[PDB]
Structures are given as C-alpha cells and as structure tokens.
Design a protein around this ligand. Structure first.
Ligand SMILES: C[C@@H]1O[C@@H](Oc2c(-c3ccc(O)c(O)c3)oc3cc(O)cc(O)c3c2=O)[C@H](O)[C@H](O)[C@H]1O
Ligand SMILES: C[C@@H]1O[C@@H](Oc2c(-c3ccc(O)c(O)c3)oc3cc(O)cc(O)c3c2=O)[C@H](O)[C@H](O)[C@H]1O
Ligand SMILES: NC(=O)c1cccnc1
Ligand SMILES: NC(=O)c1cccnc1
Ligand SMILES: [Cl-]
Ligand SMILES: [Cl-]
Ligand SMILES: [Cl-]
Lengths: 469, 468
C-alpha cells in the first residue's frame, strides 16, 4: 500500500489551491442531520489508523512511484514531490497529523462532530485533506454497525413483547454477507461492524480483523453452527431430498444444525419430510442441538408464516407466559432470504399478529446487512471548518443555497454533554469557554502514532441498547 | 491471506454433507434472468491471481484454521485431513479447473459465464469451498455492466444532439473512492469502470490494472486538476472570487474543474464567472477549458439553470443538429446525485431544452461504485453436476415459490447460435457438437492461471454496438 496513491486524484492538485501562507487546515467528520437513523455507532477508525496511517508511510520509492504515475495520469507534473519529501526527511515518513475522536462504540446523535483532523507542521497544511478519502471510508463500518444495531432494536422490542425477556437476542441476526460484498477487505470490515451488536456470523474474515486491530478476552468474537446449502441437498438427486436431510441431521446430531429446506418444495419438506418421514429424528434432539429449518425463497413474510403454521400442526406447540405460540426446543426456523431492516420489521410484526413468539425465529442477512448501504444513508461527510492564513485563524464553512442540509460547521469544534446529559457540538472554539465541561473527543493519532485505543469488548459495551442497559 | 479462512463458515461443514462416494462436484456461475439484459464479464482474473493460484495451503495455515474453527464452532468439524491432502499431494496447489468466457465479453442474462470442478476425486468438497471468493466477481461484473449501460445512454444522447460520439469516453468520471466500503473495493470497482471510460479520480484502479491485466499505454485512466470545497471555502466567504481567480490562474493551460456551489451556485455562474472573472475564461484555450461544477440541489433543475445562466453570459452557438453549444473554453460537470436513473433524466431534460450533450459531463461516486448489490444481476453460483458411485447425475434446485431461482442441469457449455446470439447448452449436450465451439476456456487448472487477457483486449470486447 502506498498512501501517496491512496487519495482522490484531484487532491494531488490541492496544495496549489489553498490561500498563500496557510499554515493550518482543520477538518471534521460528522453524520449530517437530514427508519430515521437518529443516532450512529462510531466504529472503524482504529482499523484505518493502524492499517494505513501509522508509522513510516512515506519512502523514497513510494514518492518516485507516485511521481511516475501522476505524470501520466495528469499528463503533467503537478504532484507535490517536495512536500512529500519534507515529511520523509523531517519526520522519517511519519504523518504530522493529529486526529481527535469520540470513543469507538459510542452512540452519538446525527449532526455531531465524531472526529477532527489537523496538521501539526505548517509546511503540511495540504496533508489534512489529502487523507480525507481514506478517513471518509469509515462511513462503512459506522453504517454497518448502526444499521445492525437498529435491527437489534427491532428484534429486542418484539422478543421482549412476545417472550418477556431478551434471551437469545445476540444470535437473532446472522451475517450471511461474505459472498455478497464487493471485496475480501470489505467482508472483514463489515463483518466486524455487525459483531459490535451480535455474535453470529458466517463471514469468517471478521474474526481475524477483530483479533488484529481491536481484541477480545474471548478466543473469538463470533460463532457459527453447521448448516447445509443447496449443493449439499441437491447433489443427492431430487428424489432423495429425504436421504440428504437424514444424513445431515445424523452427521450433526449433537450440535444445532441448519438445513435449507426449499430446494424443491419448502412446504412439502416441512409437512411431509420433517413433519412425518424424519419426525422421529427431530423430536429426539437435545435443546442444545435443535434442527433449524431454513426457507430461502418466496415472499419472506408469507413463507415464514406458512412454515410456522405447518410445523405447529406436526410438532407439539406450547403457549408461553405472554400468550404466544412456541415450537418445541429442538426445532427452530431461520429466514435467511430477502432480509433487510425493512423486511425484518415486517416479518416480526406479522409473526406477532399471528401470535407466534419471536423465540421461534432467527434471521440471516447478507447483501442487506453488509452491501446495500451507501455513504448517503447517514450523510457521512468530511469538511474543513478552520484555517490559519497569515497567522490569523478563520472559521470556514460551506452553505449551498439550494441545500440547507449541506451547510457545514464553523471553526474549531468540540463535543460535550448538555446539562440534561445529551450531546452538543460547540463551534467557533466556544468549547474553550468551559461552559459545557471538557471536550469528549480524545487524541487518537498524533505524528504517526496511535495514542489511544479501544478493545472490541469496550466497543460492544459502549454500543449496548438502552433496553439492554 | 489464508484461503482456509476465506469461505462462509457453513462451508467448513459441507464435506460431511455430500452423498457418500461422490468424486466430482461441478458448479457454475450465471447472472440469472428475471433491464440489464446483457452483462460484461470482468474481474475473475484478479481473483485467480490474487487469491487462488500457487501454493495457497501451508502447515501453518491449516493449524491456524483448525484453531479458529474449534472456537468458532465450539466443536471440531474442520476438514484438516482433506486440506493436508492438498498440501502433501499438490504442494498446496488447488486441484480445481475453472473455465470462463473471455473477459470483456458481453453476454445476455441467464448464460453460463464460468464453471468450476475438482480435478482430484478426494477434493469433491473443494469446488464449493471457493464459491464465496468466486461469487465476489459479482462486483466487478456489476460495476462494469452498470457503467456500460450509462455509456449507452450517453452515446445515444450525444449522437442525437451532436451527430457524433466525440468525447464519450470522458463523459462519466469516477468520483467514488471515498464512497466505497474499502481500499480493495475502490481498486476493483474503479478498474471495472475503466472498462468503459477513461476518466477517474479513484487512483487505486490504476495499480490494480497494471498488476493484474496490463495496458499498452502507461496508464488506463486520467484526471485533471479540480477544486473541492476546502480549497474554495478556505479563502473566506467574502473571497470566493479570489479563490476562483487563483485556481484558474494556477491551472491556466490544462482543463480545470471548479466547484461553484459553496455559497450560491447561481451567483457564482452569473456574477463571478459571468462578469467579474469572465476575462479569465474567454481567453482560455479549447484544450484547457474551465469546467464549472455544481454540487447540490435537484440535479436536473440545477444543470438546466446553470446552462441558462451561462448561455446568457457567454457566446452560444447552434450546432448542425440544432442544439445549443457553449464556447469551447467552457463546460459543466454534474458530480452530485448521479446514478443511472438521474443520468438519463438529466440528458433527456437537456435535450428537451435544446442543449447539446457536448456541454456536460458527469461525476458519479456512490452511484457508480457503491450503490449496487449481487441481486441487481442475480449473480449466482450453483452445483449442476456430480459424479457419485461413478455415475454422473444432473443436479439443480427448483423452488416452488420462485421459478426465477431454478438452476441449470448437468454439464454446461456456451455457444453462438446460428443468428449470432448466445445459448447455454445443458446436460452435456455441447458434446453433440451441433453448435460450434464452446466459448468457455480453461483459465485456471491445478494452481496455475492457464489463460490471461490484457486490459486492452477487455476494453475491445466490451465495446458498444454504436461504437462498432
Ligand atoms: C437453535 C439456536 O442456535 C443458536 O442460535 C443461532 C441461530 C438461531 C436460529 C433460530 C432461532 O430461533 C434462534 O433463536 C437462533 O441460528 C444460527 C444459524 C446459523 O447458520 C449459524 C448460527 O450460529 C446460528 C445461531 O447461532 C443458539 O444456540 C440458540 O440458542 C439456539 O436456539
Ligand atoms: C474539458 C474536457 O476534458 C476532458 O473531459 C473531462 C471532463 C469533461 C467535462 C465536461 C464536459 O462537457 C466534457 O465533455 C468532459 O471532465 C473531467 C472532470 C474531472 O474531474 C477529471 C477529468 O479528467 C475530466 C475529463 O477528462 C475531455 O478531453 C474533453 O475533450 C474536454 O472538453
Ligand atoms: N449458514 C448459512 O445458511 C449461509 C451462510 C452464508 C450464505 N448463505 C447461507
Ligand atoms: N475531481 C472531483 O471533482 C471529485 C473527485 C472525487 C470526489 N468528488 C469530486
Ligand atoms: Cl445456501
Ligand atoms: Cl507448509
Ligand atoms: Cl469536492
């Protein structure tokens, strides 16, 4: 990786565009005020700081490589070779930048400063926004973690209402998204952000990222169980679906096992194969090793409701203390097709209306969890708010006439608690007046070193739901 | 990177689930039919080289996978024996054969694009182990296809309003680096866009193409100097004119894009560019025009109003098709809110107001590289053929509630039809040789990349019919 080649092309030309004699550029990131997504989980900056920003990130070879690429890319010499060589020669290639940030896992309302960036050497005024592109990619772990947490809120509300408790909540939304993201790197980042809120994942890449960059007291941060796919059912031949089911549940007789049941006819599979032909292999299973029946096609709500009605007529159903129907403990359902935050809500509400406890179901979500998200969902944005030119600090901002939502904050910023205990971002250096106590941002990066860090266990604690607290 | 840790967790358990006595699992990838009628096949070569080729198994990688899965499953289910077999027998090279349509080929939906099978009977479980990594080809396929569909829209409008396609390759600029989910995604996605266009600010695409594909030219994509809000607003609100003047003077002999909406896009166009600094604009060369960049408001309404303002402050001509044309030193780039749908809305609105598409280019970020999912083209990998007890059987899924999810049966091959279209033959019927040559070629076999394509070849294959 070369940091010189890790920015938007136009930023190569920006050192020539700032006012002459500018010694400081100070910028900030927020999730701009616009499912409402009123609060965001701050997560993922520590990965970027360690993987890409810390240590000796400039070398002679990297400067020469960037110079050669940009000469052809712009068909002109605009690259700031002198400016990058200064960092190499004066700081042994360590970035003279200070980043302050809210602690990871913190849950912060929209429209608040989450981190700030400024140069610590006047010669490197151009460096602050060079690294905008790499830092703004924190939108992705923030957005995955936030959207996953919002689904946890829905699941908690309906589990509490239909069961009286939150038992099993952290296994109710399983990450199926490894194949449906855009790269291996994205898979690890996104899976780790989901694991802020839940413990079930099939996206193995998230485990090593957490281990390397954050850390947990437990050996791994996420868990899985054996499960079938269409290839392991259909390979037996259509007339032998029962044989596949029997082989798989017998191979995994002592752990939970998920069996995709829709290869040919989900309803026949539930009613006749699981329901009658193999029922004796299901009712014998342990409470710690249930069969998890997995539909994977059709209208998600309609299919879940019909699967439950079928199973409730073939297996003993109880009524829990809240009055909701409950399958026996050796039998559960996972809906892992078509699940995003909207369809999740529709399914749990439809189950509730039909008197089925949320204890009976879990969800797998792939593209909806890790890929169908954009930087626009939370309006993640990085902007310059303060500069020093000719020794004079200036509060700077953008205020487009057509769009008030794009207006940006002015001056030096700080994050505080209000008297009622909420968050406020103070502008124009007003945090210095100390009317709102101390700034909640902490220096996390300075002059090539990570200066403050969070374990994954601390991040999880910070991101807990109120209903959990 | 450890390929043992690069699969969906459940696939760790599948070796125990296939029918006993199974010696072959054969699987295929298609962009299922459900408008995106045709897809650009692009990106597999990156995956083959970065992740699949060579010695990908070691004793350390097996032990690390064994340790992780013991904790991840709270059980010992990992196939250590099967992975050690590959290590000891093949020096850690994967006994897999992959056949694929040439990269850059434009193929209608519902056709086989690549197949995967094991070459050693002991490794029947390996074909679908690597499904997860191979299915991520959905992303470069989808970026390249969606970018090409935008090129079709641009080409149709440019041709209608101008009579030619001059400049088409620079009409959709990649602004997506900050709006994708990772550095790796940025390079992959930017490279897929460059199949169709030459303008990019997502620098990461250049090194990927150089390392994995190659071009005869030094670089596959190009940029020009451009401002951002920080370089305008840093001058102070009262000094926007000073920022504009400084920037166009610093870049007086190359094209320069200047974001103009920091405070009031319409004031900037009419009064700053159109009056105060007009003398610095009309003196510019055709080779180095000023590109005015709005970045907020309704994308169509803003473009039309910007053009109306500029048309009243600068000399406008009428081209031979009857459409209005700004002077050659002045152009506009709309780089906010652009996806395939709004691009179409903008060029159609311009046409209705008699403005040539020569006047405009588009920047797209999230719309171009992030707002896409595997479901857009229904990219899917399924087993279609197995050999069990020495007999081949045709395998498929056919869910009752969704006919669109039905998969193909048996050994597959891709052919040209007599009318020049494409057909996927199932059940090994390609062996009857009624349809000429199979278009799938072996690209990977037993840890080696057998066939490779340059980026120049891929671009040629992905050309539009109108260009042809
Ligand atoms: C059968 C369930 O398995 C485990 O939870 C998971 C579920 C699950 C399923 C249905 C439910 O109603 C539910 O409450 C949970 O499903 C999984 C599926 C996978 O592919 C992988 C997993 O790890 C779980 C996974 O860990 C937990 O052991 C849960 O206690 C048990 O009820
Ligand atoms: C000023 C234009 O530059 C080049 O195209 C680009 C454009 C562009 C703009 C407006 C138009 O109406 C248009 O036809 C093109 O914009 C760019 C913007 C960037 O940030 C970077 C670029 O490389 C181009 C970029 O390369 C083309 O060579 C075009 O001939 C010329 O008119
Ligand atoms: N474990 C599963 O059922 C699963 C995992 C990943 C993708 N699809 C299904
Ligand atoms: N060159 C540009 O105007 C640009 C690049 C990347 C993101 N936004 C704007
Ligand atoms: Cl599956
Ligand atoms: Cl080894
Ligand atoms: Cl910008």
């Amino acid at each position: 990786f070369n940091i010189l080649l890790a920015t938007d092309s136009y930023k190569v030309t920006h050192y020539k565009q700032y006012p002459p004699n500018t010694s400081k550029v100070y910028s900030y990131f927020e999730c701009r005020e616009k499912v409402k997504y009123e609060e965001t989980v701050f997560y993922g900056l520590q990965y970027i700081l360690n993987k890409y920003l810390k240590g000796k990130v400039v070398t002679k070879e990297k400067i020469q490589e960037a110079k050669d690429v940009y000469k052809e890319h712009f068909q002109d010499d605009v690259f700031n070779e002198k400016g990058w060589n200064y960092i190499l020669e004066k700081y042994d290639g360590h970035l003279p930048i200070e980043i302050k940030a809210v602690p990871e896992g913190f849950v912060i309302p929209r429209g608040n400063v989450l981190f700030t960036v400024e140069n610590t050497d006047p010669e490197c005024y151009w460096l602050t926004n060079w690294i905008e592109t790499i830092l703004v990619q924190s939108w992705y772990p923030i957005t995955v973690a936030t959207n996953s947490r919002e689904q946890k809120k829905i699941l908690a509300k309906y589990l509490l209402e239909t069961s009286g408790n939150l038992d099993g909540l952290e296994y109710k939304l399983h990450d199926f998204g490894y194949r449906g993201v855009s790269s291996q790197e994205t898979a690890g980042i996104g899976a780790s952000a989901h694991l802020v809120n839940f413990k079930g994942t099939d996206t193995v890449a998230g485990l090593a990222l957490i281990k390397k960059y954050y850390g947990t007291k437990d050996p791994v941060p996420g868990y899985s169980v054996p499960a079938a796919e269409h290839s392991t059912i259909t390979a037996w031949g259509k007339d032998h679906e029962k044989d596949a089911f029997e082989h798989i549940v017998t191979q995994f007789s002592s752990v939970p096992v998920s069996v995709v049941s829709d290869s040919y006819d989900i309803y026949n599979a539930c009613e006749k194969i699981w329901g009658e032909d193999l029922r004796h292999l299901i009712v014998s299973r342990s409470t710690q090793a249930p069969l998890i029946i997995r539909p994977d096609s059709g209208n998600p709500l309609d299919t879940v409701l019909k699967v439950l009605e079928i199973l409730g007529k073939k297996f003993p159903v109880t009524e829990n203390s809240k009055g909701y129907k409950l399958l026996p403990p050796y039998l559960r359902v996972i809906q892992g097709d078509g699940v995003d935050i909207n369809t999740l809500q529709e399914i749990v509400e439809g189950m509730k209306q039909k008197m089925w406890s949320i204890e009976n179901i879990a969800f797998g979500s792939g593209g909806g969890l890790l890929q169908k998200l954009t930087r626009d969902l939370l309006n993640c944005s990085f902007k310059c708010s303060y500069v020093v030119t000719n020794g004079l600090g200036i509060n700077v901002f953008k205020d487009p006439v057509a769009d008030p939502n794009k207006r940006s904050k002015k001056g030096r910023l700080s994050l505080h608690r209000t008297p009622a205990g909420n968050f406020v971002t103070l502008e124009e250096g007003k945090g210095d007046l100390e009317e709102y106590g101390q700034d909640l941002l902490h220096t996390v990066f300075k002059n090539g070193k990570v200066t403050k860090s969070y374990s994954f266990d601390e991040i999880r604690k910070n991101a807990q739901l109120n209903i959990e607290l």
